[PDB]
Amino acid sequence: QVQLQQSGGDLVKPGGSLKLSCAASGFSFSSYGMSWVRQTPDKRLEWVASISSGGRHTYYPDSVKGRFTISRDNAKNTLYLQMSSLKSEDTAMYFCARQEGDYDDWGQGTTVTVSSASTKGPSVFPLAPCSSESTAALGCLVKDYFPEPVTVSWNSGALTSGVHTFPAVLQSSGLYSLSSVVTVPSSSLGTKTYTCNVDHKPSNTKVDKRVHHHHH
């Protein structure tokens, strides 16, 4: 199973530097060119860098030339992107991809946010109604974090049906907030428990919150 596991998202000041890593497994790493592709906040895709299988040839668009360096460790099966003199335009989700140009496999992505603001970890709050009785709803409010992203799962990934995790909103404070909810038949409330798993890697925050069926 081809696998490209990338480093966590991170905040960098303008002009700052950062090194991203992508650990590959499940294929002959030393036989493939590798690439970095980024997705900007407007969801456009932009090629960032490519490297030949052995590392002799590196390729860059003019927008990053002299600032970014792509490298690879064929013993560790790891791909790197050293970023420097970072600009606000560099804010994006950076994907590690197999092949130089014909991207057959993609990593999960690393969010890089270039800004002067400081990191803030989220507060996680339960969402539960005060009380049709067919469907019931429980949730988690993930409030006031920076930068993006947070990831949310339920019951350590065992629960996927009925889960709605909303896109984050930017509050007037400059902090992000997001909610995730589960909608279940009311009969399920009797015997099942519902726990939201929240991860904010930029602040090293991991929280599991069991949400109770009634408000206190």
Binding site: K143, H164, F166, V181
Partner: protein
């Protein structure tokens, strides 16, 4: 640089109907080697891009025959004979032949339903944990509705609220082509304790009349 332009930018298709996505290149993209190198990506919501077609017409293994790629010269086309649930997401074309490698801006495919789906409406009071920190967030949830257009109005003691709430909408659900929406009303704890009735009023084509969900801060 080779510019790739896609059309349409937003694609709404009734389930089962064909759909076509166009990708136009500023220059031709036939190199030497007599090879294509125009590719198509699908990015499903919250997922990594997955290649569907890497040349003009070569379909990646595991992709149904409904997806076909065609074209040559400056204009390229991706066709889905029958649009199914798993086809929703953003489609990108790109060329990996010549530096710099370039992508199209992306085409969002959304599913169109023949019948409406009404939202299930829930309201959530602020948690005691949050109230201790000096803020109160009230959440209104509209679950599994269609069309996307919906009006959410917050009322606090019958006063219409403006400027103190934010909405988020999930991407279209694969299973039934419905949306879900979250609206969060954010108040200070001091302000929250000064009022009694918190209500979310929803207008939607799936509702015969506007539905109001409410709670009383004390009576909970």
């Amino acid at each position: 640089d080779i510019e790739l332009t896609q059309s349409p930018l937003t694609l709404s298709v009734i389930i089962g109907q064909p759909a076509s996505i166009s990708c136009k290149s500023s220059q031709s993209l036939l190199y030497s080697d007599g090879t294509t190198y125009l590719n198509w990506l699908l990015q499903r919501p919250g997922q990594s891009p997955k290649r569907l077609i890497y040349l003009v017409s070569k379909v990646d293994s595991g992709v149904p025959d409904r997806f076909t790629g065609s074209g040559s010269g400056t204009d390229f086309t991706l066709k889905i004979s029958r649009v199914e649930a798993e086809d929703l997401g953003v489609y990108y074309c790109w060329q990996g032949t010549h530096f710099p490698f370039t992508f199209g801006s992306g085409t969002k495919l959304e599913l169109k339903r023949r019948t409406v789906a009404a939202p299930s409406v829930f309201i959530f009071p602020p948690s005691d944990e949050q109230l201790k920190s000096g803020t109160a967030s009230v959440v209104c949830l509209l679950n599994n509705f269609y069309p996307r257009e919906a009006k959410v109005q917050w009322k606090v003691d019958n006063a219409l609220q403006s400027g103190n709430s934010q909405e988020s909408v999930t991407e279209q659900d694969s299973k039934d082509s419905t949306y879900s929406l979250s609206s969060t009303l954010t108040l200070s704890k001091a302000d929250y304790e000064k009022h009694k009735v918190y209500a979310c009023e929803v207008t939607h084509q799936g509702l015969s009349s506007p539905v109001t969900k409410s709670f009383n801060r004390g009576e909970c």
